[PDB]
């Protein structure tokens, strides 16, 4: 299920910077950024492999990439923000 809609200016700051980040291709923090995400317990809709990507959202005093990730659907108009490393998600509006 995904847990409603969230504004961008709700998030971490952390998380405008990794949505320019992943609209100017890079550059990425970890290594990670960008894999695809395998929604393998199917909480987002189904998709085939390799419709969504995740991203870090940099958590702050953090040693590890913390459990916060964006994951892009499609185009530009279906982001997720998950604070919970995939256990729950809300649609991004990051006009708000």
Partial sequence: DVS???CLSALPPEATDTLNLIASDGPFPY???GVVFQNRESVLPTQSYGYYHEYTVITPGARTRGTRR???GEATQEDYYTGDHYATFSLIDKTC
Avoid: M
């Fill in 31 to 33: 290594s990670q950024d």
């Fill in 70 to 72: 964006i994951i892009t």
């Fill in 4 to 6: 409603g809609t969230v």
